[PDB]
Amino acid sequence: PTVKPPTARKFIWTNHKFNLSGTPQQYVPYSTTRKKIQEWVPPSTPYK
Amino acid sequence: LHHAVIPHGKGGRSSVSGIVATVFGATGFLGRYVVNHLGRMGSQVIVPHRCEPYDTMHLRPMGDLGQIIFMDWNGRDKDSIRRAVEHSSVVINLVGREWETQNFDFEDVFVKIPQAIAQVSKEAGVEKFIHISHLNADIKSSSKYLRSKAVGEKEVRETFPEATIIKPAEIFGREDRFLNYFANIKTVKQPVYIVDVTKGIINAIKDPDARGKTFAFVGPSRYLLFDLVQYVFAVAHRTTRDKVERIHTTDKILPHLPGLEDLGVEATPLELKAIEVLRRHRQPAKTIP
Amino acid sequence: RPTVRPRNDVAHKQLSAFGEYVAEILPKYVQQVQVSCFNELEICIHPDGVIPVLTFLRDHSNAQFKSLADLTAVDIPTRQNRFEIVYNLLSLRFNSRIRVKTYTDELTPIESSVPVYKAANWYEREIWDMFGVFFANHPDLRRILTDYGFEGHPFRKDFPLSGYVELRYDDEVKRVVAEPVELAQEFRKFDLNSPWEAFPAYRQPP
Amino acid sequence: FAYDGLKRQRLTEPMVRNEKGLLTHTTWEDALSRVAGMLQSFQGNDVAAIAGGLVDAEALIALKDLLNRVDSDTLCTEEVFPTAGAGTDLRSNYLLNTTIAGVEEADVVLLVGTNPRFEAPLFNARIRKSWLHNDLKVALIGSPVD
Amino acid sequence: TSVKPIFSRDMNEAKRRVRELYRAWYREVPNTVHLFQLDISVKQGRDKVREMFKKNAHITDPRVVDLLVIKGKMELEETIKVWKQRTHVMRFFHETEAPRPKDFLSKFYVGHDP
Amino acid sequence: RGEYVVAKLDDLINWARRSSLWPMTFGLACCAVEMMHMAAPRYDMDRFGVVFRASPRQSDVMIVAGTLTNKMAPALRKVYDQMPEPRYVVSMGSCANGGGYYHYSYSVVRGCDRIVPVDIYVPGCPPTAEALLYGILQLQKKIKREKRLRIWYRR
Amino acid sequence: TYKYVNLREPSMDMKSVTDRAAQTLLWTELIRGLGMTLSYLFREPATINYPFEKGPLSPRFRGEHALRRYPSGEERCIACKLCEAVCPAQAITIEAEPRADGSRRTTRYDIDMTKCIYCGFCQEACPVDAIVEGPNFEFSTETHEELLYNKEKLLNNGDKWEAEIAANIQADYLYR
Amino acid sequence: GVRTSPTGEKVTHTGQVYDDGDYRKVRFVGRQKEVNENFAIDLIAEQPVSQVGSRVISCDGGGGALGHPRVYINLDKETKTGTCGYCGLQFRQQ
Numbered sequence A: 001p002t003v004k005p006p007t008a009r010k011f012i013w014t015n016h017k018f019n020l021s022g023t024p025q026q027y028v029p030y031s032t033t034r035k036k037i038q039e040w041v042p043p044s045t046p047y048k
Numbered sequence B: 001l002h003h004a005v006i007p008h009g010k011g012g013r014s015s016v017s018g019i020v021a022t023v024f025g026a027t028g029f030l031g032r033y034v035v036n037h038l039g040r041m042g043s044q045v046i047v048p049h050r051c052e053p054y055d056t057m058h059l060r061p062m063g064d065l066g067q068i069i070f071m072d073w074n075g076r077d078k079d080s081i082r083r084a085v086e087h088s089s090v091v092i093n094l095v096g097r098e099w100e101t102q103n104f105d106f107e108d109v110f111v112k113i114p115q116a117i118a119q120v121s122k123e124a125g126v127e128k129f130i131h132i133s134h135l136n137a138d139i140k141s142s143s144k145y146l147r148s149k150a151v152g153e154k155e156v157r158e159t160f161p162e163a164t165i166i167k168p169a170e171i172f173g174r175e176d177r178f179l180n181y182f183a184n185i186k187t188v189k190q191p192v193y194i195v196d197v198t199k200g201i202i203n204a205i206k207d208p209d210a211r212g213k214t215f216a217f218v219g220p221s222r223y224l225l226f227d228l229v230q231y232v233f234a235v236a237h238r239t240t241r242d243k244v245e246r247i248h249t250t251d252k253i254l255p256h257l258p259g260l261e262d263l264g265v266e267a268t269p270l271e272l273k274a275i276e277v278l279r280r281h282r283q284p285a286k287t288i289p
Numbered sequence C: 001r002p003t004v005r006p007r008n009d010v011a012h013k014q015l016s017a018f019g020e021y022v023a024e025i026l027p028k029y030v031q032q033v034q035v036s037c038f039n040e041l042e043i044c045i046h047p048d049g050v051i052p053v054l055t056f057l058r059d060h061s062n063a064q065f066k067s068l069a070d071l072t073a074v075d076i077p078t079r080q081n082r083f084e085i086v087y088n089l090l091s092l093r094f095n096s097r098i099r100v101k102t103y104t105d106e107l108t109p110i111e112s113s114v115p116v117y118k119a120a121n122w123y124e125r126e127i128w129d130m131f132g133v134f135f136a137n138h139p140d141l142r143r144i145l146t147d148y149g150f151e152g153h154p155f156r157k158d159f160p161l162s163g164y165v166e167l168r169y170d171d172e173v174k175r176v177v178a179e180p181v182e183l184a185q186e187f188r189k190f191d192l193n194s195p196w197e198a199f200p201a202y203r204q205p206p
Numbered sequence D: 001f002a003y004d005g006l007k008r009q010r011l012t013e014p015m016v017r018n019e020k021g022l023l024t025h026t027t028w029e030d031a032l033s034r035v036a037g038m039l040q041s042f043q044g045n046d047v048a049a050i051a052g053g054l055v056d057a058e059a060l061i062a063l064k065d066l067l068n069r070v071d072s073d074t075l076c077t078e079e080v081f082p083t084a085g086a087g088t089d090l091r092s093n094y095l096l097n098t099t100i101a102g103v104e105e106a107d108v109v110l111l112v113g114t115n116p117r118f119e120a121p122l123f124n125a126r127i128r129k130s131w132l133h134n135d136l137k138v139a140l141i142g143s144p145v146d
Numbered sequence E: 001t002s003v004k005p006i007f008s009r010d011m012n013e014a015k016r017r018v019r020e021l022y023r024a025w026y027r028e029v030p031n032t033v034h035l036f037q038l039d040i041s042v043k044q045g046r047d048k049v050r051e052m053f054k055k056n057a058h059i060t061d062p063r064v065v066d067l068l069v070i071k072g073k074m075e076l077e078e079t080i081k082v083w084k085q086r087t088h089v090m091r092f093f094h095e096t097e098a099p100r101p102k103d104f105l106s107k108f109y110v111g112h113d114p
Numbered sequence F: 001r002g003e004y005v006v007a008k009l010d011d012l013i014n015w016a017r018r019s020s021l022w023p024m025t026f027g028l029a030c031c032a033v034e035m036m037h038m039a040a041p042r043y044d045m046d047r048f049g050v051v052f053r054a055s056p057r058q059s060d061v062m063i064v065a066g067t068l069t070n071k072m073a074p075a076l077r078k079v080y081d082q083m084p085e086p087r088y089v090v091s092m093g094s095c096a097n098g099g100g101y102y103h104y105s106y107s108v109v110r111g112c113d114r115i116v117p118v119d120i121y122v123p124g125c126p127p128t129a130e131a132l133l134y135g136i137l138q139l140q141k142k143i144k145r146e147k148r149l150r151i152w153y154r155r
Numbered sequence G: 001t002y003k004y005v006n007l008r009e010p011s012m013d014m015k016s017v018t019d020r021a022a023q024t025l026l027w028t029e030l031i032r033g034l035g036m037t038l039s040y041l042f043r044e045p046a047t048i049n050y051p052f053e054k055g056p057l058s059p060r061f062r063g064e065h066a067l068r069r070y071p072s073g074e075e076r077c078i079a080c081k082l083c084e085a086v087c088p089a090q091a092i093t094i095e096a097e098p099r100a101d102g103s104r105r106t107t108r109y110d111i112d113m114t115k116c117i118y119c120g121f122c123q124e125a126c127p128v129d130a131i132v133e134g135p136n137f138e139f140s141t142e143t144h145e146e147l148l149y150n151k152e153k154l155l156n157n158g159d160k161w162e163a164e165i166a167a168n169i170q171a172d173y174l175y176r
Numbered sequence H: 001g002v003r004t005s006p007t008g009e010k011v012t013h014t015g016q017v018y019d020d021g022d023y024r025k026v027r028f029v030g031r032q033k034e035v036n037e038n039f040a041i042d043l044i045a046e047q048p049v050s051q052v053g054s055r056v057i058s059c060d061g062g063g064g065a066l067g068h069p070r071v072y073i074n075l076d077k078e079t080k081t082g083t084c085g086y087c088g089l090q091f092r093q094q
């Protein structure tokens, strides 16, 4: 890279990170989608 | 309910049981069976551990991916207790040694720690709280172990009134300190099987009638300590001052308290399971009606 | 034409002539003979003819199919005899191959061919294991590929892909236990077939 | 395109009223025990049921059977039909007896008090097909809708 | 209705093979319990064999019975030869499966399946 | 002080145990071949103190290198139960990590972590011999973090 | 055409017979075998000094996956699901919807790296060079869950590795 | 457009976050929530509109065979710009 440096981009990490397994910085998977079924919310005022 | 904790599936490893349980003292004899049963049906289990991560590796295969979560905690640190319980729906306390150490005596593990868990759990909003005491808990007891249990039982019931308190006799099982205790060596004992105790705890989590109640988990039969010990050596083809006090304490009889049969658990005789425990060490024992 | 597999008429004619040869000699058992456009000869026979037809092909001087390349089954649920048993034989003397095919169902036994080829021993055990076809007079018929005590025949078209049970180590009983299968992610079925016919030459009359 | 309405405002849990008079989630055991207690304390005309517009036949007969066990006949729908005369005794009284495919053989259709375009759009599409390919004649009594 | 028999030409001859297999299994259970150091009693092992046999008491096809016997003899061979391990023998007892209730109300509470 | 003593005793046994990791390899399938290439001269696992062929009686780490079928699961658990402690498991390749390309098969255990506890997962089908070496060196660092004595002292 | 590997006639004249007798008693072939192992002791070994030295890899190497962007920073992926269709292991799971600006984009893009066979079929099938297998092969983890990548993990891999990924694609795309 | 919720958890570019009563956020306790902070929706909006002198323009995303399939974008409407369906670049007629 001292001779042919990489193509600069806005989004490329400026600070490289080593493997983070086993530390507080480790990756934790989760579902990236939102809730699909909305439940009905009962009324707050009484009425029976 | 909350949409994420509605039960789904057929009650297996990949199912969703709806239980989010924090189990303190999960790295011991009772905790492994409790955690195993919780993960059998697909519960989220939080395991606060004081020990090495290496000593908690036997719990990893007990739950599908992501279902067993491990956190560090210190019994004296309230924040570390708060972190482990604020997302749970039930908190289970199985903390306790059978001996005192220079750092923790029986008051620390049977009064101070259970009360700290109960106080943090109540403040954090946990609805269900299960606390394990002892059948022979008594402030008039010769054993400092059993005297501490009685005090901690009182403080738990006053700090978390809805807590379900369970009072088992000595528990026999593969890793127990009871049948294995004898095999490595006036009183009437009524020991109970480890799996029965585990089912009782699980059934208490699922039963609304168990909230606020105290149960006594005892085996189907009462034996004379001498007769039982003779059986152990026959099956196996063959310590502290306080420990001896407990082993010599006749098992209380508490008819007023509910028991395993109330939680739908049929107690298991020691004779069906004695070989299981004692085969590794290689005629019945008179029962008291 | 660079992209098209060339035909071989010499081999096609030769395999057709041997197809008639076998059919004329064993009319008691041969039900059909065909040669594919890529020159493979198939003899379809009645299942009673397994031993006679294979023995003839192995020992006859103008056949000499000494090697049993493979022996397998095919489950076709629409047929009343759902199982098709395929013998692929190789002749070193004449540098040729032949396929012999028969059929059976879940209950009819097929005669074991171990007397004709010792290679058939394990192949027939595999067929029993994977498909549930029983071979009569086999010197040692038993499962070969599946777990001991495994229920079912996994290669049948109606056996589910992931089976019925799955294993895990249970710490309570201190052994590997079997339980009904639950999948964190179900296998996703794809409907890939296009609704437009691709090969007019294979159209079936309505 | 209405199927997306199946994803919102959904009833997902049994609910009963609390001491505040507000609906609160509860288990199937609790909700059904409350309903059964009330059902066992009433009989005859004291118990009724109204069926909505999307109810299936298996639920309709089950509910009929249950109220009959307490000797109630008040099984009602929301959509009126005159009970005078035969009422529902004879199916032909309340059916489209010609069938949808029968419109293609009619030569005159009289539409009385209805807007088939919005009430039965595919039935109205079947009339237009006859109107187009068979020169079907159509007369309407009611508002002059498109 | 003309079919090739497996072993037995009618249900009488088939029932004889069933009884012989049952005797072989019955005599084997004490050995299996000891050889595999099972935690079940010999009585439980024998009641299991009996329950496995009664499951198929309703068959009337001599060919189906013959296959059931052929499979049972294979299972017996795998047990006698100690080709099975202790895990295999104990899969007959489903020891880690929570009892699944069979009445309507219990099924209704838990889920959708019949 | 006693803190400083256990700090150095921890550093000593931890240094000894990660400088002498003796594996026994379940070469179950493909991934065993890449495990052999890690023993081969280019990478020479033996130069890290990781002996090539070790009996199960003297093994410290188990490497599950390949698909674990249902028929083999009982045998895997047997060997694991016989390993003397401390013992660690490295899961090598997609098959052992979670079933991999046979995940939906009827005869395949969907991840060896259903049978035994696992300390390191090495991804790849198969991981390169150097990728497996990275996982072994990552296990050493995991051992280096152990603190059995400091926790024992604080009991 | 064929040849014989072991069809030789041992001479039975006295000179030949004594040659085999001296071989038997003086262990000549065994000592010759000792010479070969001795010559290797003095050869330079082929070991490389990992992790300070790395084995050589080519631009085509199939390693850890990453989701790429355009030079503007817009995601390349358009939720076409061709990668998900071709995946031999069914390791990819995708969900999509119109983005707030109306673009066709994914809301879910997971790869089960413990199902993946690292075959590279997904990067072949992708029409816009969105999903790639990068050059990283040193991402072993301590837990199973860490290997179940979602879209946030995959985009972070792309931003982390884009410098090298772009250079590798530049080197090999004329063979594709 | 990284944005934390009232509970403090960062909202992802897909709008995902665990609501207050969701136990599933226990998975982040003692660890972290992987969130990519380069929102593509915000980045493409930073690109200026190209001014072109024809009713139809083609886009391949740049880089020739390294971009996306080449498409042709009609610029007849004046109310809005023409957007590429692949890369989101915008074009307007002059």
Ligand SMILES: CCCCCCCCCCCCCCCCCC(=O)OC[C@H](COP(=O)(O)OCCN)OC(=O)CCCCCCCCCCCCCCCCC
Pocket (backbone or CB within 6 Å): G024, G025, G026, G027, G030, G031
């Ligand atoms: C003037 C009067 C004098 C009278 C006295 C005259 C005596 C001298 C003449 C006789 C020479 C005697 C030789 C003594 C050595 C033993 C020779 C011998 O036994 O060889 C035969 C033996 C088996 O050979 P085999 O191929 O199996 O055929 C025979 C089997 N039916 O072959 C084998 O031994 C098997 C090989 C085993 C060794 C393999 C591993 C080591 C090989 C390398 C070792 C190099 C030697 C190291 C020297 C150590 C020095 C300290």
Ligand SMILES: NC(=O)C1=CN([C@@H]2O[C@H](COP(=O)(O)OP(=O)(O)OC[C@H]3O[C@@H](n4cnc5c(N)ncnc54)[C@H](OP(=O)(O)O)[C@@H]3O)[C@@H](O)[C@H]2O)C=CC1
Pocket (backbone or CB within 6 Å): B024, B025, B026, B027, B028, B029, B030, B031, B049, B050, B051, B075, B093, B094, B095, B096, B097, B098, B104, B109, B132, B133, B134, B135, B168, B169, B170, B171, B177, B178
């Ligand atoms: N088993 C029996 O015979 C009976 C047991 N009980 C009660 O059941 C509960 C568990 O029984 P058992 O499982 O046999 O007890 P164990 O000793 O087997 O396990 C005790 C648990 O408590 C934890 N623990 C102990 N002291 C501390 C501490 N100071 N700080 C934090 N964690 C601690 C241990 O973790 P670590 O591994 O880190 O020490 C372990 O997980 C106890 O409360 C016991 O009194 C009641 C009646 C009979």
Ligand code: SF4
Pocket (backbone or CB within 6 Å): F029, F030, F031, F065, F066, F067, F092, F093, F094, F095, F096, F100, F101, F124, F125, F126
């Ligand atoms: S993970 Fe890949 S290389 Fe390893 S055994 Fe499975 S298929 Fe073979």
Ligand code: SF4
Pocket (backbone or CB within 6 Å): G083, G086, G087, G088, G089, G090, G091, G092, G111, G115, G116, G117, G118, G119, G120, G121, G122, G123, G133
């Ligand atoms: S590399 Fe192959 S197995 Fe892995 S995600 Fe891509 S297509 Fe699927």
Ligand code: SF4
Pocket (backbone or CB within 6 Å): G076, G077, G078, G079, G080, G081, G082, G083, G084, G094, G125, G126, G127, G128, G129, G130, G131
């Ligand atoms: S990564 Fe490529 S192939 Fe996969 S959905 Fe996105 S655009 Fe389509």
Ligand SMILES: [Zn+2]
Pocket (backbone or CB within 6 Å): H059, H060, H061, H068, H084, H085, H086, H087, H088, H089
């Ligand atoms: Zn574009």
